[PDB]
């Protein structure tokens, strides 16, 4: 069978405060985990995850087939040509078991300059009716800002870990323009579970989603307490243990580009488990025009032979690529 991945628990609460030495000792732990399996659990993060999970369960269990079509992205509903990222991603029963709801920055309103310009990757969120889902929109928008705050603090820790000043990433991660997304994913219990909805890895492992690197700077994930993720390491795929009190953190491929693969984006995959569960990732993306010049923390002059890449170019190309590689979610 499969060995357990080294996924350390890191107390990130110093990243919210003003004790600089304490922040450096957290940054060393982020450096060590980023150089090893590429995952860690952030603990003492301050977010009420049990309430997050209850509000998300109340949504997923009450939304109706009618509302799903009315919120659906354009892959499922040709009438919704402006919904590429934000909205409902339907299951196809008998075939594709998972379903999800994605939303973006609540500041992308109709008056926002990037929405007015129809800039790629910016959309206005769609929401179910308030009378059918009382409090859901307000809860989900507040959640966005709670996990934005955690992610800002983690970005301070990654900056310090790389030998940079603490706002090195955080200065590009801003409420008015971040391209970050929340996805509320439901994995169902089904009996019988359709075989068509189960993928098979080359090593025979049954999967819900195949190997990939994330399209993100970092990913900040809350999951139910059901083991399912695996990370590829030099010793093969290893199981990431569950912990539904902490947030599971890893780097995405923009971090790997910026750092010349010093912090790799770890390749990971989702095992098939026949269980009713939740997966609530926040993909930490910067602004459309954000560019950070690539560097290499293993080279004495810190220079890299990678070209600067704007975050908007990275994100539009990555979201398309991920769909082409592993299919429409
Ligand atoms: N819709 C989100 C991005 C979602 C990206 C995505 O599907 N990631 C999956 C890939 C599994 S094959 C994952 O990390 O498990 C957005 O528009 O920001
Ligand atoms: Fe992923």
Q: Is 242 in the pocket of ligand 1 (CB under 6 A)?
A: no
Q: Is 322 in the pocket of ligand 1 (CB under 6 A)?
A: yes
CATH number at residue 302: 2.60.120.330
Domain count for the chain: 1
For the beta carbon of residue 174, count every other beta carbon within 10 angstroms: 15
Buried residues in 215-227 as b, exposed as e (16+ CB within 10 A): bbbbbbbbbbeeb
For the beta carbon of residue 21, count every other beta carbon within 10 angstroms: 7
Q: What is the 3-state secondary structure (H, E, C) of 146-193?
A: HHHHHHHHHHHHHHHHCCCCCCCCHHHCCCCCCCCEEEEEEECCCCCC
Residue with tokens 């929401």: 127
Q: CA angle, corner 34, sides to 32 and 36, nearest 5?
A: 70
Give the mutation target among 98, 222, 319, 323 for probing the ligand 1 site: most ligand atoms within 8 A of CB.
319
Q: Which residues constitute the domain of residue 129?
A: 1-329
Assess contact for 214 and 253: CB atoms under 8 A. Answer: yes
Assess contact for 72 and 241: CB atoms under 8 A. Answer: no
Query: For the chain, what's the residue count?
Result: 329
Angle of helix 136-161 relative to helix 20-35, nearest 10 degrees, comes to: 90
For every residue of 20-36, DSSP letters joined together read: HHHHHHHHHHHHHHHHT
Q: How far apart are CA 72 and CA 75, in angstroms?
A: 8
What token pair was written down for 76?
A: 């499922």
> Who's near 138: CB < 8 A, 6+ residues apart?
none
Q: What technique solved it?
A: X-ray
Angle of helix 136-161 relative to helix 49-62, nearest 10 degrees, comes to: 140
Nearest to 230 by CA among 37, 29, 99, 49: 37
Residues labelled as active-site residues: 209, 212, 214, 268
Q: How far apart are CA 162 and CA 297, in angstroms?
A: 7
What is the C-alpha R_g of the chain? 19
Closest ligand 1 atom to the C-alpha of 283?
18
Q: Is 326 in the pocket of ligand 1 (CB under 6 A)?
A: yes
Question: Residue 27 to residues 80, 97, 117, 131, 292: CA-CA distances in angstroms?
Answer: 43, 39, 39, 45, 20
For the beta carbon of residue 154, count every other beta carbon within 10 angstroms: 26
Closest ligand 1 atom to the C-alpha of 85?
17
This structure's resolution (Å) is 1.4
- What is the residue with the minimal CA distance to atom 18 of ligand 1? 181
Q: How far apart are CA 168 and CA 10, in angstroms?
A: 21
Give the mutation target among 215, 231, 279, 285 for probing the ligand 1 site: most ligand atoms within 8 A of CB.
215
Distance 129 CA to ligand 1 centre (A): 25
What token pair was written down for 146?
A: 């709670």
């Amino acid at each position: 069978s499969v060995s357990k991945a080294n996924v350390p628990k890191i107390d990130v609460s110093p990243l919210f405060g003003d004790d600089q030495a304490a922040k450096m000792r957290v940054a060393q732990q982020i450096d060590a985990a980023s150089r090893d399996t590429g995952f860690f659990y952030a603990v003492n993060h301050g977010i009420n995850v049990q309430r997050l999970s209850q509000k998300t369960k109340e949504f997923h269990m009450s939304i109706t087939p009618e509302e799903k079509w009315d919120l659906a992205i354009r892959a499922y509903n040709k009438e919704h040509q402006d919904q590429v990222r934000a909205g409902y991603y339907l299951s196809i029963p008998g075939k594709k078991a998972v379903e999800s709801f994605c939303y973006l920055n609540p500041n992308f309103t109709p008056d926002h300059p990037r929405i007015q310009a129809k800039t790629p990757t910016h959309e206005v969120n769609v929401w179910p009716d308030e009378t059918k889902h009382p409090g859901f929109q307000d809860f989900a928008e507040q959640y966005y800002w709670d996990v934005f705050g955690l992610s800002s603090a983690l970005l301070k820790g990654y900056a310090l870990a790389l030998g940079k000043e603490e706002n090195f990433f955080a200065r590009h991660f801003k409420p008015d323009d971040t391209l970050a997304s929340v996805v509320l994913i439901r994995y169902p219990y089904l009996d019988p579970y359709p075989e068509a909805a189960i993928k098979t890895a080359a090593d025979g492992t049954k999967l819900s989603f195949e190997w990939h690197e994330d399209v993100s700077l970092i990913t900040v994930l809350y999951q139910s307490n059901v083991q399912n993720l695996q990370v590829e390491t030099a010793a093969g795929y290893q199981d990431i243990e569950a912990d539904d009190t902490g947030y599971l953190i890893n780097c995405g491929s923009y971090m790997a580009h910026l750092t010349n693969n010093y912090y790799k984006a770890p390749i990971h995959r989702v095992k098939w488990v026949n269980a009713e569960r939740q997966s609530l990732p926040f993909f930490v993306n910067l602004g459309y025009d954000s560019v950070i010049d690539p560097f290499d923390p293993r080279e004495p002059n810190g220079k890299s032979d990678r070209e600067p890449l704007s975050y908007g170019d990275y994100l539009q190309n990555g979201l398309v690529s991920l769909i082409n590689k592993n299919g429409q979610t």
